[PDB]
Design a protein around this ligand. Structure first.
Ligand SMILES: CCCCCCCCCCCCCCCCCC(=O)OC[C@H](COP(=O)([O-])OCC(O)COP(=O)([O-])OC[C@@H](COC(=O)CCCCCCCCCCCCCCCCC)OC(=O)CCCCCCCCCCCCCCCCC)OC(=O)CCCCCCCCCCCCCCCCC
Ligand SMILES: CCCCCCCCCCCCCCCCCC(=O)OC[C@H](COP(=O)([O-])OCC[N+](C)(C)C)OC(=O)CCCCCCCCCCCCCCCCC
Ligand SMILES: CCCCCCCCCCCCCCCCCC(=O)OC[C@H](COP(=O)(O)OCCN)OC(=O)CCCCCCCCCCCCCCCCC
Ligand code: SF4
Ligand code: SF4
Ligand code: SF4
Ligand code: SF4
Ligand code: FES
Ligand SMILES: [K+]
Ligand SMILES: [Zn+2]
Lengths: 206, 94, 95, 263, 379, 114, 112, 48, 176, 125
C-alpha cells in the first residue's frame, strides 16, 4: 500500500525477545518492557537501577550498547514523579538501538551515569539546567545553556514561554540590566484540539 | 571563456589541469530561465472507485506499544551480529 | 474614496483617522500617513451586473485555478442580485 | 436487576432497557458520529451518520434511534461501520458549498471535524452543486442556507424547546428547504440557541459575523447577570476584547441554553 | 598554570595553559541558546519544521529530513518514491554545502584563506538549487513530513548535472592547496588523536568515529529513504587525527558527487508528497474545486494533522554526524516534547579530552576538525 | 514518607552546610567588589547576602535546603571564577526598577493587580 | 600476523588463542560465585562456553574471527574483558533479586 | 545584454540620471528598477 | 563498502628517499601550490557588478510580502485567518468585520517583518492567493518601526509589484 | 539509604518564580466546558489548571495587545483533580477547584414522537 508505512515483524520479534532477555537478567530493576509498533524497544526501570542496567547494556557480550546517542528528560506535571529520564543507546555490534527510561521528582537525585558513558557529562548538565533534576556524583554539575544567574528551569511545563525577566541596555547605569518582562504583543494562545477523537486504538478506559 | 590562447596555456600549465574544459563560470550550457509549463502526475489515491479511505489509512493502523513484560532457553542479542564491511573495489586506497 | 478629516488627515478605507486631541498623530509630523488610494469597495461597485439565463450560476473569480474556490450562486430572488461571497461580482437572471 | 447486558466492541456494559445503541457506546467513552441527533431534542434519525454494524446483522442500524437488545455486540470501528460513515459523509459534502474560508463555522465545525475523522480525504463528485435561496428571520440569526445539511435540529428546537412552530421544511427530495416559507422573523427569547445547535454555518450569529476565528479566542467560564436565573456562560475574548457569549452546560440551571439577552 | 577566558557561532573558552601547553579546556556555551525545544511545544508539527533549518544552519535540508522521518514514523505513513529520491539528492547536495564550509573555514582559521573563496562560489551555485526548488537560498523548509513541498522545476536536474560534472575538479584544486602541503600537515597530523574506544564512549558520531577506524555510517547500517539503492564508499581513517578527518571529509565530498550522479539518473516519476490529504495538503487546484479538499486544506493549515501518541528516537547520518530527534506525541496536533540530538554537542564536550597535551594553536584546529555549529549545540 | 536524601539526612546537617555556604559568601564579597570594580560597599554586598539567606529561613525540609545550598554554591563558583560579568553580579540589586507600591491605596491608584 | 587492527588505540595481539582461553576461563570462574538460577549466570555461561569451544576448535585466527562474528580478534578479546569486568560488578549488585519497588500506578501511562 | 558573458554578467542596467525628481547621476539604487524589468534583470524570466 | 584514506607505506629505496629529501630541501610541493594560485590570478573572476548586475533568482523566490487584488480591483483577502493560524512566527495580526456593503474583509492586517521568518507558509495557506511573498528583497530601512507593516503598506506593495507578482505566479502555479 | 521527611512538600523556593507570581495568583482547576458550537466531547476529558486573567492594553504603536503577566498563557493538564491539586499545593498557588460537570443520562425514545395521547407527539419531521 503506497501511502502506509510497512511493518517489520522480524525486527519486532527480535526486539521482543531481547526485551524479555533483559527483564529476566535484571528483575531487581526492570519494571516494564514494551516494543512500539515501529519497532523501538523501551526498558522502564526503577531509578536505583540506572548504573547497573546501563553497565549491563554497555558491557554484556549479547548487548554491547557502546554509544549513548542521547540523554534527556520529559516533564509530565500530572505524575507524582514528574520527570521522565530517557537514555537512548546504540549498539554497533548488533546494529540496534534501545531506550532506557526511569523517573524522579524535583527533590530526589538520580545517580550520574558519567561512569558508564563519558557522553553523559554534558547531557546531565543540560537536564539539570533545563529541568532542575540533580545528578549525584557528577564530576562538575552546573548550568550549561542558560545565562549566568538565571533563575528557574525553562523546560518545565509550568515555566512560562517568555520567562520572567528581559534584558536591555540602560544608559544611566552603563550596563545591561534585567527587568520584569513586558511584551508589546502578547503571545496568542491557540486552542487547536478538535473535540472529536482521532485515534480509537489509543482510547483510554472511561 | 574569452581568455587569449597564451593566457589559457599559462594557467593550464601553472595548474597542471585542462581548466578550459571545466570552467567554474557558467555560460550557455545552463537551462533557459523560461520553461514550458509542467503537467504533474497524480498519486495512487486519485481513483474514482475501489478507493475507500479506511483501506489506506496509515494513521489508524498505528497501535499502542506491545507490553512484553510488566511488574503489574538460548541467549539472544537485539539483532543478529552486524556483517563485516567489504573493502571497496572502485578504489580501496587513496 | 480618500476623504480628509477637519484636521487634514486622510481617512483610510477602514475608516481610521486620529481625532483632534489624539497625540498619536505626532508620528506623522515631518513624514506621511501611508494610505492606499484604491478603495476596493468603490472598485467592485463599478463592475456591471452579469446577466445570465439560469437559476444557478458559478463563480471561481476568473483565471481558473488562479481565482478563488468555486461557489454556486442562487438567483431565484428577483429583488436583488446574487453576489459572490469571495470576489463580490454580481449576477442577475435574465427575463 | 432491570439492566440488560450488551457489548461495545466486545466489552460488556449493563444498560437500562430503552437505551439506544448510541447511548451504550458512550458508557464506554465512545462517541458515535452524528449530525441530526441531539440529546435534548427528539430523535430524528435522518442524517444517517450514526450508522453502526451489529455483529451478525447484515444491515447497519442507526445508533441514535435503535434501542439496544440484550447480547448485541456493537462494532463501532469495523470495516462495515467505517464504510457507512465514509459514504454518508460523501453524500453530505456533494452539494455543500466551498465556503470554509468565508464561513464563520470554520474551525469549530462538526462537518469539517467529522469529515477529517470519519470521511474520505478527496472527492469524486463531478457535477454542479445545488444553490439555495437565503431566508431572513430577524436581526440576530443570519442564514446562509446553501450550507444547510437538512438535519432538522433547528426545526425540532423551535417546536419543542422554544414552543414556536414557525420553522419547517418545504419542497421535496434534493430541493427540500428549511425555513419559514413566508417572510417571517424567528423572534423568540430563545431564538439565538439555533446558532449553537446548527452543526454547520447555515445559521450564524449576525453580530458575531466575521470578527473572529474559534482557535484564537480565550474562553472564560463565567455567569450571566441579565436575569436572576444565573445561566452558566463562556465569555469568548481575543486580545483583550469580548467577542461573544456562549452557553455553558449546567444541568440544574440553564442546561445548554441561554436567552437572547444573555447572548 | 595560566588561566585565560577566550572568546566573547560564538564560543567562550576558559583554558588553563602551562607555557605553550593546554592543561585544561572548558568550553562555555549557551551563547546561542534560543529555547528552540520549548518553542516547538507551542507549534503544530508543520509549524515546527522551520526550526530545524536553523539548528545546523549549514545542513538545512538534512535537518528537515531527520525531523520529517521522525514524524512520518509516528504517523505510520511513508513518502512517495520520487520524494525519497529528491530527499537523497538534496541531502547529498547539502552534504557538499556542509563539507565545503567545514574544510574551507577549517583552513581559513589556520591561515589558508584562498580555498574558502574558490569553494564558496561553488556554494553559491548550490544555494541557487535551493532557491529554485523552494524560493529560499538556505532555510528552504522544503523537506516536510510526507515528502517535499513542490516538485522540481523543469530544467533543474540539467543544471545540477552541469554543476556536478565540474565539481570534482574543484575538489582537486582544494587538495592541491592542502593535502600535501607540509604546513597543512604540520598543523593537522597527529593533532587531536582520539582512540576508537574513547570515541564511542564519549558519544562521538560521523567522521569523528570513522577517522579513528570505526566502520560506521547510518546511511549503510540503518538506511533511510532510498539510500539502500545507491552505491558509495565510506572513507575510513587510520590515525584518528585531524589530518585523517580532513581526508575523510574531502573523500566524502567525492562520494556525494558519486551519489548525486546516481540520483540524477534514477529519478523516478510520480507525485512528490504522500497522496493522503489528512497528512499532506491537497494541490491548490483541488482545494478550489472539491469540498473534501478545501476542508482538508483548511484543517491542515489551522489545527494541523494529529499524530498518534508515542515517542520515537529517529536519526540520520547528517554531514556533521548523527543528528536525531526524540519526538514525543501526545495524540494531538502539537508535539509534547522534542529533544534535538545534535552531533556537535558530544563532539564539543570532547574538546578538553582531545586537546590534552597540545598547544594553544592546536585547539583552533581541533575545534575545526569537529565541525562545530553552535546553532545545533545550543539549540 | 520515606525519601532518598541529597546530602543531608536531617535539618541539623543541612544547617551546617548552610552556615559553611554563608561563610564562603561573606568572605568572598570583598574580593567581588574589588574584582568587578563595583560601585557598592562591602557592607551593601554583605547585607544582600544576608537578605538572600534570610528569605529562605522558613524551610523545614532538608532536601529543599540541600538544593538551595547546591544552587548557592553554583552561584558562588560563577562569581569566584569570573564567569559572571559586572552585569550579572549587579542584578541582585535592581537599580533600574522603580519601587513598586506596597499599600492598598498606592496599588489601587495605579492599576488592577493585587 | 596482521600489521594493525585498524582501530586507533587497539593494539595487535600476538597470542589471541591463549589470551581468549584465559579470559573465558576466568569468566566461568567468576560466574561460579553467582547463584545457580540467576539468569545472568545461565546465559553468560552458555554464550561464554560457546565462544570457548570455537577458540579450542579453530587454530586459524582468520577463520576463528569468522566463526566468532565479533569483529577483529582484538575486538573479541576486549569484549571478553568487558564481560569479565561486568560479571564482577553483578556480584555486588545482585540484579537477580526481586524488584526493589513498584512504580506509582500511572508512572508509565502514556498518553496521560 | 551580452550572452557571451558568463551567467550573471550577461544582463545589466545603466540607471537613469534622474528619477522622480531625485538626482541619480552618482546615487543609484537597486530599488530604482521597476517591477516589469525587475523580473528580466534577475533572470526570473527570459523575455524582457 | 569502505576505502582507506591514508593507509600507505612510503618506499624506502634510494630513489624514493632521495625524492622525498629533494621535496624537503627544495620545497617542491610548496612551489606546486604557488602554481595553483597563479593559475587563478589569470582566470576571469566570478564577481558581478552589483547593483548594475543582479544575482539570478527564480519565480519561487520568497521576498517582501504584498496583498493582492482581483482584476476588478476588489481585494482578494476575505479575512479567513488561515495565514495568521499557520504563521510559524505569529508575525500576522488580523481583525475583520462586515464591510459597508456586507463583504467579509479585514480591518487590520499587520505583518511584523522583524518577527517574520520569510517561510512562505502564509501564501501556501491562503485559499485565494491574497497574501504572497513578492520578488523584492531590497527594502532595508533606517528604523525598526518602518518594518511593522499594516494593511495600507501591504496593499501598496500589492499595487506596486503586481505586474511582476502575477507573472511569477503564472510561472509557478502549475507546480502548486 | 532513606530518610523520613514529615514536611508538607513545598518547592516555592527552588522554582525561581518571582514572589508576586506565587502569592497573588489564583489558579483555577477545572474540566473545560464543552464548546457549545460543536457536539464532540473529546476536549472535556482532562483536568486543566489556568491562572487569573490580568490586564491587557493596546500597544501605542500598532494597537497590538500588550501584557505584563508572565502566566497569561500558562495552562497545565492533569489526569485527575487530585494530581492538579497536588501540583498547585507544592508550588504555593492558592486555587479554586470546580467539580466536573457530566451530562446526566437521558431517556430517548423514537417512538414517543408518535404518541397516541401524550404531548411528545411531534407535528413535523
Ligand atoms: C607584466 C604585465 C604585462 C602588461 C601587458 C598585459 C596585457 O595587456 O595583456 C593582456 C592580454 C589579455 O589577456 P587575457 O587574460 O586573455 O584577457 C581576457 C580577455 O581576453 C580580455 O579581452 P577583452 O574582450 O575584455 O578586451 C577588452 C579590454 C582589453 O583591455 C586591454 O587591452 C588590456 C590593457 C592592459 C594594458 C597594460 C599595459 C602594460 C604596461 C606595462 C606596465 C604595467 C605594470 C606597471 O578592454 C579594456 O577593458 C581596457 C580597459 C583599460 C584597462 C586598464 C589597463 C591599464 C594598465 C596599465 C596602466 C599603466 C599606467 O594578455 C595577452 O594577450 C597575453 C600577453 C600579455 C602578457 C601576459 C604575461 C603575464 C602577465 C604578468 C603580469 C603579472 C602581474 C599580475
Ligand atoms: C586630499 C585630496 C584627496 C582628494 C580625493 C578625491 C576624491 C574624489 C571623489 O570624491 O570621487 C568622486 C566621487 C564619486 O562619487 P560616488 O562615490 O558617489 O560614486 C558613485 C558611483 N558608484 C555608485 C559606483 C559608487 O564623487 C563624490 O562622491 C562627490 C563628493 C566629492 C568629494 C570631493 C569634493 C572635495
Ligand atoms: C659543490 C659543493 C656545494 C656545497 C653546497 C651545496 C648545497 C646545496 C644542497 C643544500 C640545499 C639546501 C636548500 C636550503 C633551503 C632550506 C632547506 C630547508 O630547510 O627546508 C626544510 C624546511 C623544514 O623542513 P620540514 O619538512 O618542515 O621538516 C624537516 C625537519 N624534520 O622547510 C622549509 O623551510 C619550507 C619553507 C616554508 C616557507 C614556505 C614559503 C616559501 C615557499 C616559496 C619559496 C619560493 C622560493 C624562494 C626563492 C627566493 C628568491 C630570492
Ligand atoms: S459549514 Fe463547515 S464545512 Fe461547511 S463551509 Fe462552513 S466551515 Fe466549511
Ligand atoms: S439550518 Fe442548521 S440546524 Fe437547521 S436543518 Fe439546516 S443544518 Fe440543521
Ligand atoms: S513568511 Fe512565514 S513567518 Fe513570514 S508572515 Fe508568512 S507564514 Fe508568517
Ligand atoms: S491573506 Fe489569505 S489566508 Fe490570510 S486572511 Fe486573507 S484570505 Fe485568509
Ligand atoms: S445521528 Fe443518527 S441518523 Fe442522524
Ligand atoms: K452554527
Ligand atoms: Zn467570485
Amino acid at each position: 500500500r503506497p501511502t502506509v508505512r510497512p511493518r517489520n515483524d522480524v525486527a519486532h520479534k527480535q526486539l521482543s525477545a531481547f526485551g524479555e532477555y533483559v527483564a529476566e537478567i535484571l528483575p531487581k530493576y526492570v519494571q516494564q518492557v514494551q516494543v512500539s509498533c515501529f519497532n523501538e524497544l523501551e526498558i522502564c526501570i526503577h531509578p536505583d537501577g540506572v548504573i547497573p542496567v546501563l553497565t549491563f547494556l554497555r558491557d554484556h557480550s549479547n548487548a554491547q550498547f557502546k554509544s549513548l546517542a542521547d540523554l534527556t528528560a520529559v516533564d509530565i506535571p500530572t505524575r507524582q514523579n514528574r520527570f521522565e529520564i530517557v537514555y537512548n543507546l546504540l549498539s554497533l555490534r548488533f546494529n540496534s538501538r534501545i531506550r532506557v527510561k526511569t523517573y524522579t521528582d524535583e527533590l530526589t537525585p538520580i545517580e550520574s551515569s558519567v561512569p558508564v558513558y563519558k557522553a553523559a557529562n554534558w547531557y546531565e548538565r543540560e537536564i539539570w539546567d533545563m529541568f532542575g533534576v540533580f545528578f549525584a556524583n557528577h564530576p562538575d554539575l552546573r548550568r550549561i545553556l542558560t545565562d549566568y544567574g538565571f533563575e528557574g528551569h525553562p523546560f518545565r511545563k509550568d515555566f512560562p514561554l517568555s520567562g520572567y525577566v528581559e534584558l536591555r541596555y540602560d544608559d544611566e547605569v552603563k550596563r545591561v540590566v534585567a527587568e520584569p518582562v513586558e511584551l508589546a504583543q502578547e503571545f496568542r494562545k491557540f486552542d487547536l484540539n478538535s473535540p472529536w477523537e482521532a485515534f480509537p486504538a489509543y482510547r483510554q478506559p472511561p | 571563456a574569452s581568455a587569449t590562447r597564451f593566457i589559457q596555456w599559462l594557467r593550464n600549465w601553472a595548474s597542471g589541469r585542462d581548466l578550459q574544459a571545466k570552467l567554474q563560470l557558467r555560460y550557455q550550457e545552463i537551462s533557459k530561465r523560461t520553461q514550458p509549463p509542467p503537467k504533474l502526475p497524480v498519486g495512487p489515491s486519485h481513483k474514482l472507485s475501489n478507493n475507500y479511505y479506511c483501506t489506506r489509512d496509515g494513521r489508524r493502523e498505528a497501535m499502542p506499544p506491545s507490553i512484553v513484560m510488566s511488574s503489574q532457553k538460548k541467549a539472544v542479542s537485539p539483532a543478529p551480529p552486524i556483517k563485516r564491511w567489504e573493502l571497496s573495489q572502485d578504489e580501496p586506497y587513496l | 474614496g480618500v476623504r480628509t478629516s477637519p484636521t487634514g488627515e486622510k481617512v483610510t478605507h477602514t475608516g481610521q483617522v486620529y481625532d483632534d486631541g489624539d497625540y498619536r498623530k505626532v508620528r506623522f509630523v515631518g513624514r506621511q500617513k501611508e494610505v492606499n488610494e484604491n478603495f476596493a469597495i468603490d472598485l467592485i461597485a463599478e463592475q456591471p451586473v452579469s446577466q445570465v439565463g439560469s437559476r444557478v450560476i458559478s463563480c471561481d473569480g476568473g483565471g481558473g485555478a488562479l481565482g478563488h474556490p468555486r461557489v454556486y450562486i442562487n438567483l431565484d430572488k428577483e429583488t436583488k442580485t446574487g453576489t459572490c461571497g469571495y470576489c463580490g461580482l454580481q449576477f442577475r437572471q435574465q427575463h | 436487576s432491570n439492566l440488560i447486558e450488551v457489548f461495545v466492541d466486545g466489552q460488556s456494559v449493563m444498560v437500562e432497557p430503552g437505551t439506544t445503541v448510541l447511548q451504550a457506546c458512550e458508557k464506554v467513552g465512545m462517541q458515535i458520529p452524528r449530525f441530526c441527533y441531539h440529546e435534548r431534542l427528539s430523535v430524528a434519525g435522518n442524517c444517517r451518520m450514526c450508522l453502526v454494524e451489529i455483529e451478525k446483522a447484515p444491515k447497519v442500524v442507526a445508533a441514535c434511534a435503535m434501542p439496544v437488545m440484550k447480547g448485541w455486540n456493537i462494532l463501532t470501528n469495523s470495516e462495515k461501520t467505517k464504510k457507512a460513515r465514509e459514504g454518508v459523509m460523501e453524500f453530505l459534502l456533494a452539494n455543500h458549498p466551498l465556503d470554509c474560508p468565508i464561513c464563520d463555522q470554520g474551525g469549530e465545525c462538526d462537518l469539517q471535524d467529522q469529515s477529517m475523522m470519519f470521511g474520505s480525504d478527496r472527492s469524486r463528485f463531478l457535477e454542479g452543486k445545488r444553490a439555495v435561496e437565503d431566508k431572513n428571520i430577524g436581526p440576530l440569526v443570519k442564514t446562509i442556507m446553501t450550507r444547510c445539511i437538512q438535519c432538522t435540529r433547528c426545526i425540532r428546537f423551535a417546536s419543542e424547546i422554544a414552543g414556536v412552530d414557525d420553522l419547517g421544511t418545504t419542497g421535496r427530495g434534493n430541493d427540500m428547504q428549511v425555513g419559514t416559507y413566508i417572510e417571517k422573523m424567528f423572534m423568540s427569547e430563545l431564538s439565538g440557541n439555533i446558532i449553537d445547535i446548527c452543526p454547520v454555518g447555515a445559521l450564524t450569529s449576525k453580530p458575531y459575523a466575521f470578527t473572529a476565528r474559534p482557535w484564537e479566542t480565550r474562553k472564560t467560564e463565567s455567569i450571566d447577570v441579565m436575569d436572576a436565573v444565573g445561566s452558566n456562560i463562556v465569555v469568548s475574548t481575543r486580545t483583550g476584547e469580548v467577542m461573544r457569549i456562549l452557553p455553558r452546560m449546567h444541568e440544574d440551571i440553564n442546561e445548554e441554553w441561554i436567552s437572547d439577552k444573555t447572548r | 598554570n595560566l588561566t585565560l577566558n577566550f572568546g566573547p557561532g560564538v564560543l567562550r573558552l576558559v583554558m588553563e595553559l602551562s607555557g605553550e601547553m593546554v592543561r585544561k579546556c572548558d568550553p562555555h556555551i549557551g551563547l546561542l541558546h534560543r529555547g528552540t525545544e520549548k518553542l516547538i511545544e507551542y507549534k503544530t508539527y508543520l509549524q515546527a519544521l522551520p526550526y530545524f533549518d536553523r539548528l545546523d544552519y549549514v545542513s538545512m535540508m538534512c535537518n528537515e529530513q531527520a525531523y520529517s522521518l521522525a514524524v512520518e514514523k509516528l504517523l505510520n505513513i511513508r513518502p512517495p518514491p520520487r520524494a525519497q529520491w529528491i530527499r537523497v539528492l538534496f541531502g547529498e547536495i547539502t552534504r557538499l554545502l556542509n563539507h565545503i564550509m567545514a574544510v574551507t573555514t577549517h583552513a581559513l582559521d589556520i591561515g589558508a584563506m584562498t580555498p574558502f573563496f574558490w569553494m564558496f562560489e561553488e556554494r553559491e551555485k548550490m544555494f541557487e538549487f535551493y532557491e529554485r526548488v523552494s524560493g529560499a537560498r538556505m532555510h528552504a523548509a522544503y523537506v516536510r513530513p510526507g515528502g517535499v513541498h513542490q516538485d522540481l522545476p523543469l530544467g533543474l536536474m540539467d543544471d545540477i548535472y552541469e554543476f556536478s560534472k565540474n565539481f570534482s575538479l574543484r575538489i582537486d584544486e582544494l587538495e592541491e592547496m592542502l593535502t600535501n602541503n607540509r604546513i597543512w600537515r604540520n598543523r593537522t597530523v597527529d593533532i587531536g588523536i582520539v582512540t576508537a574506544e574513547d570515541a564511542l564512549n564519549y558519544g562521538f558520531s560521523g567522521v569523528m568515529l570513522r577517522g579513528s577506524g570505526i566502520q560506521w555510517d547510518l546511511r549503510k547500517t540503518q538506511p533511510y529513504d532510498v539510500y539502500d539503492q545507491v552505491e558509495f564508499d565510506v572513507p575510513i581513517g587510520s590515525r584518528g587525527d585531524c589530518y585523517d578527518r580532513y581526508l575523510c571529509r574531502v573523500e566524502e565530498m567525492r562520494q556525494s558527487i558519486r551519489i548525486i550522479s546516481q540520483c540524477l539518473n534514477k529519478m523516478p516519476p510520480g507525485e512528490i508528497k504522500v497522496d493522503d490529504a489528512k497528512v499532506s495538503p491537497p494541490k491548490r487546484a483541488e482545494m478550489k474545486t472539491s469540498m473534501e479538499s478545501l476542508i482538508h486544506h483548511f484543517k491542515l493549515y489551522t489545527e494541523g494533522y494529529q499524530v498518534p501518541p508515542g515517542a520515537t528516537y529517529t536519526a540520520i547520518e547528517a554531514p556533521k554526524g548523527e543528528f536525531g530527534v526524540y519526538l514525543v506525541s501526545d495524540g494531538s496536533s502539537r508535539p509534547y516534547r522534542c529533544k534535538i540530538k545534535a552531533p556537535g554537542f558530544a563532539h564539543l564536550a570532547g574538546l578538553d579530552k582531545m586537546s590534552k597535551g597540545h598547544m594553544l594553536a592546536d585547539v583552533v584546529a581541533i575545534i575545526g576538525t569537529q565541525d562545530i555549529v553552535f546553532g545545533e549545540v545550543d539549540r | 514518607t520515606s525519601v532518598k536524601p541529597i546530602f543531608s539526612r536531617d535539618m541539623n546537617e543541612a544547617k551546617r552546610r548552610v552556615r559553611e555556604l554563608y561563610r564562603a559568601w561573606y568572605r568572598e564579597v570583598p574580593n567581588t567588589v574589588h574584582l568587578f570594580q563595583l560601585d557598592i560597599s562591602v557592607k551593601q554586598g554583605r547585607d544582600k547576602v544576608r537578605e538572600m539567606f534570610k528569605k529562605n529561613a522558613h524551610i523545614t525540609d532538608p532536601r529543599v535546603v540541600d538544593l538551595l545550598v547546591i544552587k548557592g554554591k553554583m552561584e558562588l563558583e560563577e562569581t569566584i571564577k569570573v564567569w559572571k560579568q559586572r552585569t550579572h553580579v549587579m542584578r541582585f540589586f535592581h537599580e533600574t526598577e522603580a519601587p513598586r507600591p506596597k499599600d492598598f491605596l498606592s496599588k489601587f491608584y495605579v492599576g488592577h493587580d493585587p | 600476523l596482521k600489521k594493525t587492527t585498524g582501530l586507533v588505540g587497539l593494539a595487535v595481539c600476538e597470542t589471541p588463542h591463549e589470551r581468549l582461553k584465559i579470559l573465558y576461563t576466568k569468566i566461568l570462574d567468576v560466574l561460579g560465585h553467582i547463584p545457580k538460577n540467576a539468569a545472568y549466570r545461565k546465559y553468560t555461561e552458555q554464550i561464554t562456553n560457546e565462544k570457548l569451544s570455537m577458540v579450542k576448535a579453530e587454530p586459524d585466527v582468520k577463520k576463528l574471527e569468522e566463526r566468532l562474528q565479533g569483529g577483529q580478534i582484538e575486538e573479541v578479546i576486549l569484549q571478553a574483558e568487558n564481560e569479565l569486568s561486568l560479571a564482577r560488578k553483578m556480584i555486588q549488585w545482585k540484579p537477580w533479586e526481586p524488584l526493589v519497588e513498584e512504580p506509582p500506578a500511572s508512572q508509565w501511562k502514556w498518553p496521560i | 545584454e551580452d550572452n557571451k558573458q558568463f551567467f550573471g554578467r550577461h544582463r545589466w542596467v545603466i540607471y537613469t540620471t534622474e528619477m522622480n525628481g531625485k538626482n541619480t547621476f552618482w546615487d543609484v539604487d537597486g530599488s530604482m528598477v521597476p517591477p516589469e524589468w525587475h523580473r528580466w534583470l534577475h533572470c526570473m524570466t527570459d523575455d524582457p | 563498502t569502505y576505502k582507506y584514506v591514508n593507509l600507505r607505506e612510503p618506499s624506502m629505496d634510494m630513489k624514493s628517499v632521495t625524492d622525498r629529501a629533494a621535496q624537503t630541501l627544495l620545497w617542491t610541493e610548496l612551489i606546486r601550490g604557488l602554481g595553483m594560485t597563479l593559475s587563478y590570478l589569470f582566470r576571469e573572476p566570478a564577481t558581478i557588478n552589483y547593483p548594475f548586475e543582479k544575482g539570478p533568482l527564480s519565480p519561487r523566490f520568497r521576498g517582501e510580502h504584498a496583498l493582492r487584488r482581483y482584476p476588478s480591483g476588489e481585494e482578494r483577502c476575505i479575512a479567513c485567518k488561515l495565514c495568521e493560524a499557520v504563521c510559524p512566527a505569529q508575525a500576522i495580526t488580523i481583525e475583520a468585520e462586515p464591510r459597508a456593503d456586507g463583504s467579509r474583509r479585514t480591518t487590520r492586517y499587520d505583518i511584523d517583518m522583524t518577527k517574520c521568518i520569510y517561510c512562505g507558509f502564509c501564501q501556501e495557506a491562503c485559499p485565494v492567493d491574497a497574501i504572497v511573498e513578492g520578488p523584492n528583497f531590497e527594502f532595508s530601512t533606517e528604523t525598526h518601526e518602518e518594518l511593522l507593516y499594516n494593511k495600507e503598506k501591504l496593499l501598496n506593495n500589492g499595487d506596486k509589484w503586481e505586474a511582476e507578482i502575477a507573472a511569477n505566479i503564472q510561472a509557478d502555479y502549475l507546480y502548486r | 539509604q532513606l530518610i523520613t521527611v514529615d514536611e508538607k512538600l513545598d518547592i516555592t523556593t527552588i522554582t525561581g518564580v518571582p514572589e508576586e507570581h506565587i502569592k497573588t495568583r489564583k489558579a483555577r482547576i477545572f474540566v473545560p466546558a464543552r464548546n457549545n458550537m460543536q457536539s464532540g466531547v473529546n476536549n472535556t476529558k482532562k483536568w486543566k489548571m489556568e491562572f487569573d486573567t490580568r490586564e491587557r492594553w493596546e500597544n501605542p504603536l500598532m494597537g497590538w495587545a500588550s501584557t505584563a503577566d508572565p502566566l497569561s498563557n500558562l495552562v497545565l493538564t492533569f489526569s485527575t483533580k487530585e494530581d492538579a491539586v497536588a501540583f498547585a499545593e507544592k508550588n504555593g498557588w492558592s486555587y479554586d477547584v470546580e467539580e466536573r460537570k457530566v451530562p446526566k443520562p437521558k431517556s430517548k425514545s423514537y417512538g414517543a414522537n408518535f404518541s397516541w395521547n401524550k404531548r411528545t407527539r411531534v407535528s413535523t419531521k
